[PDB]
Amino acid sequence: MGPGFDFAQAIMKKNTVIARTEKGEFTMLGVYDRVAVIPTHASVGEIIYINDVETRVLDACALRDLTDTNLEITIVKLDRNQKFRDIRHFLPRCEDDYNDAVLSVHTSKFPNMYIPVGQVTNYGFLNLGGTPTHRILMYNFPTRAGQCGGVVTTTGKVIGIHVGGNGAQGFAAMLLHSYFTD
Ligand SMILES: Nc1nnc2ccccn12
């Protein structure tokens, strides 16, 4: 509907797949080559479904900060015959607050879904489902089950993936450029 939605759509149309684990269907962001991200609570195993195709997982790494605290991001390398567009230059280098973000979801339950969530706070610590978690972003939108993995963007930046909510607020795990150096 406006330039935030333009950037969000450009990301969704080229850099997402539908990932299915035993824990559900998730929006999954492809970042570069065969490397994608998904919330750690998806419990990625040795095999995952990508757009309903059985796919071997070559590597899966549940990220933690240097205090050994959960970050809720799992980096997955997929045994896929095709690379993602490289979007690493749209990842922030540092923790930050943002204005006027969009949360975008694409699953069987919620196809072509876009949500203007407004201001995004560097919230920091969250007890997420009982698990101490760091580098959490917060937005004041009543997100729901089905939105996990959803991409949080501003114009020109991919800043996080949706990992939870409390009924009134939503929470995303930060994406940082430093997670995807090779
Ligand atoms: N997954 C998720 N995102 N937002 C919420 C809110 C309530 C319950 C679950 N949620």
- The domain locations on the chain are 1-15+85-182, 16-84
Catalytic annotation present for 106 = no
| From 110, 143, 148, mutation site for ligand 1 pocket: most ligand atoms within 8 A of C-beta | 143
Beta strands in 43-139 (DSSP E): 47-50, 53-64, 70-78, 98-105, 113-128, 131-139
Which positions ≥6 away from 83 have C-beta within 8 Å?
Answer: 32, 33, 34
Catalytic annotation present for 94 = no
To the nearest 10°, report the CA torsion of 75, 35, 39, 175: 80
**H or E stretch covering 56:** strand 53-64
Instruction: Give 20's Cβ-side CA count (13 Å radius).
Output: 10
To the nearest 10°, report the CA torsion of 9, 160, 61, 86: 40
Dist. CA 182–CA 20, nearest whole Å: 26
Catalytic annotation present for 41 = yes
Q: What is the resolution of this structure in A?
A: 1.3
Experimental technique behind these coordinates: X-ray
For residue 26, how many other CB atoms are within 10 A of its CB? 27
Dist. CA 56–CA 45, nearest whole Å: 9
- Phi, then psi, of 52 in degrees rounded to 5: 70, 20
- Nearest CA to 38 out of 68, 14, 17, 7 is that of 17
- Active-site option among 25, 134, 148, 162: 148
- Phi, then psi, of 46 in degrees rounded to 5: -80, -25
Looking at ligand 1, which residue's alpha carbon is closest to its atom 4? 165
Number of helices and strands (H, E) in the chain?
Answer: 1, 12
Dist. CA 58–CA 9, nearest whole Å: 29
- The secondary structure of residue 44, as a DSSP letter, is -
| From 27, 148, 171, mutation site for ligand 1 pocket: most ligand atoms within 8 A of C-beta | 148
Cα of 162 vs centre of ligand 1, distance in Å, is 9
